[model samples]
Target: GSELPAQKWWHTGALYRIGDLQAFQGHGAGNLAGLKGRLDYLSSLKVKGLVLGPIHKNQKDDVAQTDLLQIDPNFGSKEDFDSLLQSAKKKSIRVILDLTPNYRGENSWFSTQVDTVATKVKDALEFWLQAGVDGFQVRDIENLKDASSFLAEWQNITKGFSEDRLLIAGTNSSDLQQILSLLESNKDLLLTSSYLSDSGSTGEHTKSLVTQYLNATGNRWCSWSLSQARLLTSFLPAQLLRLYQLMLFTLPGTPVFSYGDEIGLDAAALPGQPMEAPVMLWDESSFPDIPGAVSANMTVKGQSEDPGSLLSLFRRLSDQRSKERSLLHGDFHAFSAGPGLFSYIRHWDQNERFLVVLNFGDVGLSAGLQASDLPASASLPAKADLLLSTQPGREEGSPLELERLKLEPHEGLLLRFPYAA
Candidate 1:
């Protein structure tokens, strides 16, 4: 049966999308050099890896010869690609290429192929697998029709790449079973949504879906595609973006990003004409101009510093998620919800249990559990302390001790169990 072949580490942290810079042509920038310039920013922003959209030759002349093996002359040389890999490597960031060779009609490598059909797709996979491209964004995967047979062939072909390079299916076809069966040797499948792509819109659905899969399973969620997702920017601003990123960091599977999502860059809609989707944003200031903006709940303040900003929020989430191994590999158990309080427990290792709680509504909310909920040998500190919170100093703000906890509106807190007592 098709299943992911091995355990991998590349999917362990923040996966940011690299857009506009390399995916399109005639952006008036001439080429994708801007990507080389932003390496330091992306590094500081704490992205572990990058998911680049299709950058292969979209050449007018002999389109199939657009060479999956080589970078298009219109974009940049193979040397530029090499430079990107080397530069990102220095910062410990891995790169995954979009090998959506079937996206454009009849002009694709497969469209131009004649004889020797058996080895055609296999040949394309072999080229990039050896190009040092870290992984693949298997595009137009829904069109593959027969999921089992196609994924089987794909698993067979990519059996040799380092385990870090993963296979992410870019489809909504609920073909997860096909992907699971493809794990012949050690190949693993990256899926989105828990039970099906149609799971409910809350965190419980995500938690349940995650618990169902024992093997190395991953999932993506709502408005996953470009056209459907881009429209969210019209109303909701940073808060909406933060909520999405929050889910991305906390979810059980490897969370893949579409292009230009960080810094809250979004589109009102995909372009109707030949125009680009949302205008890709690189500057830090462009994020706050959207509608429904509110005073950010958290701030990173100092002298000569304006503390509240989207970048700071992103840093807070990214830093914590990276530092917490349990967020990626822990056993997730969600607490009962009451009055807008969302709480869950993640048992990191044998000895550690971390409770993360978020309050999204207007009212303060609370929960109660016995000391027995913790491990037998765990220590109960004299007071329950906040490990991390979006509303910093909320614990200290109150004169009363937090023996029983209550979280304010829009506040999120991460607590360590067995308070020192």
Candidate 2:
């Protein structure tokens, strides 16, 4: 019965994934100090955790040959990382490092001696923990014989170090059930690209994917990422990008945001080209005097009467998710999903309830919501108030009749009502 707290600090906040560190400053290789400079920007989105990319020394920044113990000199030195960690702690941001080993060719450590590689990796984990790292994320989980071997050792060492230090792992394999089972057996969080935004998927398809996870009761043990291998904006329209963001934020698990996603950053690599990510285009006109300000062109363009750009929508929604319990740990009930439209209800603690209605089709669609649409255990007020919406110029706090609500093409809404007993 003696374990860590029931709810870790990470469980209640959004996680921002920083992909390319060198891309932060735009002029040169992004350094640890530059990343720390943007903590305020990340905090503005209510992000409480930062899942950083590989910073360890490797072959041309490849993950296959990571040095594991040393910070890549191109990024910075140990002193820089310490300073970044200290600053992040002041903002309550937990830093999670990626420690995936390279084992592909002659220089592959795992190819030569498995035992030696495993021991060194375990030691590297302890070294980082002692250096004040909050958590660790491992990639290529299938290659490792048993990830828990290192985790168990780390947990023992950190018994007095800290509480609820996270251990995250990634999976991109053919055997889905096997990977999920492996993660469950190891007692680690599962990270996958299953629910990410896709160029060929529909809202119905995505909804069913989410509903499948909800039904399995493993949603909380997983993370929903919109872009893991490629940027969502590379193929999706701006309108759909906003919708995807809303779904990810309100989904039943932790949401992972890739760098430049918050600002609609788009750069899909071409064949034979280096996969260097694009630099973040911070809007200096709207947010003048901000870092990485190349031009006023990056500023989000929109009508003040209309809901601003995708960036504004994300900030507002993220802020709401941070303060609303119903949106964070709520029970998800998939009301209905059909042909480019989907709806669900998020009800939490018997005190707050939220109704999320979405239409992803090219044309406006109407759907009538009835008492039967809600969870059988839910007792909601007869009417709900429109808390926020994707529709431009919609009146906030306007009364919404459950049965008469309709959605425009590519529209979404978050309505709230008191729990009626």
Candidate 3:
């Protein structure tokens, strides 16, 4: 009911996670030098932060080979890392390093030497902080023997360096409430997305998944990551990628996703193995067909030209999310959550309101979208201008009847209501 606390850079915009740098660079391996060159690409997408995969010195799951103080030679030198920070800062994009210690290790905490483990981990945190990284994403904190105490120490260390520094970790310690209770500041700590290894683009299951997360957290700011969504959802039609991306941007949180999701770049989890990094398709020739895809050019280079391409839609959605008051910091309200159409409203103060309607059904669906169904918090107009539609041919600003709104199957829309004041 109250206005959100003053928004930070991470709070309002999307964050792009670059997990497999080697795959992203499309070479024998990827390095910091290569990531530097891609800053412009990331900037064009309008992301405020970049979540990098583990780049520290470590062999795959080999704790004995791990070294926290230095960047993996595979990634690049310290000079290269510093250069990237300067470049990222120039573009106004903050870099978030994934300090997932024991990243490839058999034991996440590395042999359960809790004291030694904490020292190494905290030292690296300090090292990276001194080196100018914006934040960190440490996974499986519950694995730490003194998990709560470790986080508190790390929290103070981060705040001591800079109040703006962020510390993010992944789910549960048997009880998240206990871990959260130890921290003073709480914002972007654990924001796991509603992505799972199943379901269609916009089914009831998907609706329930989102609603459950919102309900569980009271719809606080969270991360809506598509990394696992795009990776695990390898079976759905590629055409629905744009619609899902649209949904991610309009929802009440920051949209975080893997590298190639923008253009529907997908890969199979190698025969009987965990899902590894899929090669990033920078150009049409670089595109790899994963046993299927009925003739779609899924590449960042190729999609940039087509206004209707998934990449273009991502850019447009990203831009809108950045500037639209309603979409950025608005309170989320469900218009209709159902078996077919999933609709919601995003409104902030007297700013132009946005009605997001996503049709993930296999068949076209129509239902009366009534303004009366909305809460007394704000009033909506019966006729709203079509801001953006899955069907690119549908011109923007075209007025549509909200009460009788219709959406094509595998389609979505962002309709706008002008400010009353």
Candidate 4:
């Protein structure tokens, strides 16, 4: 059994990847101090963890020279990083560092002995742990034969300090079986995906694949993000983007968001264009309000002023998911729906149950839920309450008939059902 042993903060939490560490500051290379300024902004989204891309000093801009123990001067000094860590801790946000041991190029360990490179990276991990990092994520696995060989050593370091300190691996491999193999090899590792669900296809093949991936991985932590692909907004229709967001938040594992995902930042790298990291949109005036958005109605010291922006939508969703046990650690069951529709339920014992429905096509659709559609041990009431919807003007207390559920064009719904009776 490759199940995750326990439920921890990282498992139930939402993670945001700061891909371009230098893109946060406008007109200047972004640095630690610049990132610290946005802690409140990230907090507004209820982001529990920040997985930062490489900010270590490197030679000739090569990831191979990543001196993981030292901060890149281009970013800032150690004092600045300390301040960022301290501030984030105060807000209950954990920080994870990214290290590249398999990067290829001159002076890269890929061209040298594994022991030498492994030792250096291990030392870097210990140094950062002492300096207050919660976890480390490793990438560039193509250059390595078997990453699982070193997991034991990596776990040895984190075990002494704290059992919860995570060691995450990047898995963009398309072979679902291979990904599952990797999951079984390393009990302490959590894998992340930049390929899953980023190809703009919500058809049956894609749906079936996602459903299988979740079931196979079981409790072992995994993530889906757009770190290596085009921006989500580049392909997904603006009105339909939140459906994907809703799926990500309610999925079995964590939801990993790229830097600009919150505001629906639309820029994608074009051929022959600059390869610089996309700058984050701090100002909301550049984008229109999210379609069908309503006032968030939550008071916060530094929340988004634009209550209808995609940023605000993410904030409200993340905040709600964090507070709910079922959505956080519940078992997932994907069931059959009408053509061009997908539906699932997330439920936990003693916690509330949620039914998630998504309409992937342009037309409306409906489906009936039978007793066989749910768990054998579970029972449902005659009706369910609409917890959230992408459509505007949907009354909060309206009851939904599960026997004849209706979904509008590109619409998604999260409904709360009664416990098994």
| Winner by lDDT | 3
Candidate 4's C-alpha runs over 4 A off are 1-6, 61-66, 101-113, 226-230, 234-239, 269-276, 284-306
Superposition error at 337 for model 1 (Å): 3.1
Tens-digit lDDT track of model 1 for 211-291: 455333433221122221122233344444544455556655555554445545445432222233454443322223442
Q: TM-score of each candidate?
A: 0.71, 0.83, 0.86, 0.85
TM-score of 3: 0.86
Best by TM-score: 3
Where is model 1 poorest over a 10-residue stretch in terms of lDDT? 295-304
TM-score-sorted candidate list, best first: 3, 4, 2, 1
lDDT of 4 by residue, 80-182 (tens): 9889999998998999887764332433345555776787678988898999889887764534555677765776687678886877776546566666776
lDDT for each residue of candidate 2 in 26-120, tens digit (9 for 90 to 100): 44537898888788877777887887767877664254455778888878999999999999989889898876656222333354546666666
1 or 2, which is superior by lDDT? 2
Model 1, residue 196: displacement in angstroms? 9.6
Candidates ranked, most accurate by lDDT first: 3, 4, 2, 1
Q: Which is the winner by TM-score between candidate 2 and candidate 4?
A: 4
Candidate 3, residues 222-263, lDDT tens digits: the string is 766543223423545676776788888988887777777777
